[PDB]
Amino acid sequence: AERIAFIPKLVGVGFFTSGGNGAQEAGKALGIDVTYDGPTEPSVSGQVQLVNNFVNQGYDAIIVSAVSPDGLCPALKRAMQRGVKILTWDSDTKPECRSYYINQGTPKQLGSMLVEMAAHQVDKEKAKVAFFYSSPTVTDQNQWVKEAKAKISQEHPGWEIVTTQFGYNDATKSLQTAEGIIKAYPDLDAIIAPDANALPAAAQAAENLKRNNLAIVGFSTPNVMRPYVQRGTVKEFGLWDVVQQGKISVYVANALLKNMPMNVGDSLDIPGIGKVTVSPNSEQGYHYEAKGNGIVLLPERVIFNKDNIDKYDF
Structure with missing residues (x-):
């Protein structure tokens, strides 16, 4: 029914393969098909084309580790403008280019x-x-x-x-x-x-x-x-634990897909992990005030x- 994309800076590297594993298993447990794909090299263009393609195919959410803080913004804003839920993990984008950063x-x-x-x-x-x-x-x-x-x-x-x-x-x-x-x-x-x-x-x-x-x-x-x-x-x-990070990202994405957005201060309880809370972007050095926008720390x-x-x- 619903589809989620989990994009690493590049494939073929343990850290990202495992993050992808955590994401995919979380999808299976939630009944959401998760597609793992990334460029062969860490680059803005390599990630942007994938984001654009997932959006064009009608994916419901995209979770990405940004190679650049600004490079993916045009593609990610376009995605959000079209209704796609956007989250980042590992490496964040400018706060305005995503909803939550699984940090x-x-x-x-x-x-x-x-x-x-x-x-x-x-x-x-x-x-x-x-x-x-x-x-x-x-x-x-x-x-x-x-x-x-x-x-x-x-x-x-x-x-x-x-x-x-x-x-x-x-x-x-x-x-x-x-x-x-x-x-x-x-x-x-x-x-x-x-x-x-x-x-x-x-x-x-x-x-x-x-x-x-x-x-x-x-x-x-x-x-x-x-x-x-x-x-x-x-x-x-x-x-x-990058596996848990991938897992958490899918659970947060699921919350958005289930129309239960979380504002700074709100929390979500994830099985096997416990409770996660949305904290202010300012803690990462870049303040940005907006509903349904913040950081979710491991x-x-x-x-x-x-x-x-x-x-x-x-």
């Missing part, structure tokens, strides 16, 4: 995870720390880093951030930068890397240089990190270590 966590939440992981490992009052991520321009990562650095200055005043460098979402560049950091700061206490490429790069660099006991924390995926965790190079790192994120890392496959 893994606010900048303060994610920034806190980074510092809490580092503090768990660091054993010196005057610890030397290095930040290592994508770029000084990437919006989301910089929001997390701004929050992390603030938390460090406020709660761990003895620490010193000795350097902040970037890997530019490039495996080769990331490894090179990581080794440079490790070679230049032999007494470094920790590397905080809130980037999927930067984290594995830092661990690989430590192993390449035979550097021991360096605290290496950040954000990345289970399958990529497992080898480093098994060797002891990385004790902990964070992210979230009840929790995940800290992976040797004990629970095998429970996830992406």
